[model samples]
Target: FSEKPTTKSDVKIVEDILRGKKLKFKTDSGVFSYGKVDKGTKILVENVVVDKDDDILDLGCGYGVIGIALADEVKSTTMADINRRAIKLAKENIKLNNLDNYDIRVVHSDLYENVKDRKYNKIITNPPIRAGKEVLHRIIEEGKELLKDNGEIWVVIQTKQGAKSLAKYMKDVFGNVETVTIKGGYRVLKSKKL
Candidate 1:
């Protein structure tokens, strides 16, 4: 299957390293901002906190930016996405960064099917909101099941795009969801399953 091509914003030029981190990334025409990192991901990396020992998953990890960023902070990370090209690029980036402490496992699952039996201490995502509400909901609904007990999930969404509603649903599922940061018209939400 192939993603539909759409007009994209201009490529973003990176001015500096993030948290003293470096990683290679691949881009495709269908992705949000192919050929470069986007603002949402930059906000996600700046706002989200990662620990070296946490078992992490990067949902919708296009070009592996999210997972790679976490792997730089955390011990290990798994990068999963439906887009095969994205996965391929993610693996290349994992190698380009020389991330010895991290092992980037790419899975081609709709949401969490490939790693259904596994549990993670943390899951971070920059969801494809363009996929519409159902796809977005599936990631939230099914992605939660992949978390270990007391594990947390973090997501970044545009503020005007009903981030609050997603956070509310997360609260319903986990009993608690917090808005950890809001910047540049985006909201970073964190939910914990106790």
Candidate 2:
């Protein structure tokens, strides 16, 4: 969840072949990036380290890009969002990608409200920048509790959009953080549960 989409739900199909699979996502107005793949998102997708046995969650998974794109890379995954419309579109994309049997859960959660009870190997996001510092920081703070041993959180943020503070806060929490990669002013941060 990057920008709060304001356009109407004029749905469109965006197709791409990634990870040796054909992906067709249905994008609409209220989702994060509508009708196309975003640059920062594409960067995260390019650099994401998906574990085949990991139970992962695509936090704030708008329109199912990350999770759907990494469908074959995970054993079980959950995609959560507060936006109902985004959830709806995410489900569409999930089926469009033929990912129904992959143990993918499409839930309505606000920052682990519905997901905190479970442990995961990875929690990934292009965090909701407009959601403010409180929500963003909590993802780094409380999200650590949701990880299993050696679990990790992968979040991407732009350098101009509190990336430094995020890295520091993650360091304070995880005792270490890595700038996993950078592309087009966006920095991808990874923190492990040690």
TM-score of each: 0.86, 0.91
Against the reference, the lDDT scores of all candidates come to 0.76, 0.87
How would you encode candidate 1's per-residue C-alpha lDDT over 17-71 as one tens digit per residue? 5656755555666555676677888888888887677889888787777777777
Residue 159's lDDT in candidate 2: 87
Model 2 CA deviation exceeding 4 Å by range = 1-8
Q: Model 1, stretches more than 4 Å misplaced? A: 1-16
> Residue 18 CA error for candidate 2 (Å)?
3.3
TM-score of 2: 0.91
Candidate 1 worst ten-residue window by lDDT: 8-17
lDDT of candidate 2 over 1-194, digit per residue (tens): 56866765678889876666778988887677888887788888888898889999999898988888887788888999998888898898888878887888889987799987689999999998887888888998988999999999999999854899889999999999999897889999999999
Instruction: Judge candidate 2 against the unseen true structure and give its global Cα lDDT, from 0 to 1.
Output: 0.87
